[PDB]
Amino acid sequence: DMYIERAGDITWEKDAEVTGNSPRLDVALDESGDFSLVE
Amino acid sequence: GETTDGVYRVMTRRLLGSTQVGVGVMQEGVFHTMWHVTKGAALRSGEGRLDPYWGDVKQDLVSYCGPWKLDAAWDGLSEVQLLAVPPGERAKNIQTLPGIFKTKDGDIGAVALDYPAGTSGSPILDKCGRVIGLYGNGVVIKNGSYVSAITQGKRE
Ligand SMILES: Cn1cc(NC(=O)c2ccccc2C(F)(F)F)cn1
Fold this sequence. Notes:
The complex is a heterodimer of chains A (39) and B (156).
Chain A: E1 2-8, E2 17-18, E3 24-29, E4 35-37
Antiparallel strand pairs in A: 3-4
Chain B: E1 6-12, E2 19-27, E3 30-33, H1 35-38, E4 43-45, E5 48-50, E6 52-56, E7 61-64, E8 80-84, E9 92-96, E10 99-103, E11 106-111, E12 123-125, E13 131-134, E14 138-141, E15 145-149
Antiparallel strand pairs in B: 1-2, 2-3, 3-7, 4-5, 6-7, 8-9, 8-12, 10-11, 11-15, 12-13, 14-15
The structure holds N-(1-methyl-1H-pyrazol-4-yl)-2-(trifluoromethyl)benzamide.
Residues 36, 115, 117, 119-120, 136-137, 146 of chain B line the site of N-(1-methyl-1H-pyrazol-4-yl)-2-(trifluoromethyl)benzamide.
């Protein structure tokens, strides 16, 4: 059986670490809700 | 039990010890998570019980205690924050500029951040603190890195 535990408030933080790129990807979404790369 | 708004961990005692299978968002008395995290199962909140109210495997979303409440959307221009809640670690905000998933049914924002699978369900926020989607349904690229859709539901 699963349970929930509070982890924090939903707020934007001014001193957050900034990282990650912004790729443009062609993808397909199947009936099981899974994404796959299409090239 | 705990109905206060905020970000929550989703835990199980089925596997070894206590394991974090995912994350969710409590807002307006409704718990919002990704379908692959709970597979539609009931949740416990202290001594209280959360029952699924709505869900869709193709959207990979599920709501508890009421209908989907999160209606904000990425503007397609500005940076956002992943409020990452990794297993056994403190909630941490990470700022990024989303990329794009181009599909035959239209375009969706995507965040290129690598976190363990138990981070699925962590909310993605706009500059006003509104939840524009959940992190955790996406694709693995070239070296094993992860890129997640910004997955959002519809508020009726
Ligand atoms: C169908 N499904 C989709 C997921 N999604 C993840 O597992 C997942 C979610 C967030 C970060 C990393 C990951 C992954 F690398 F792939 F491990 C799990 N099950």
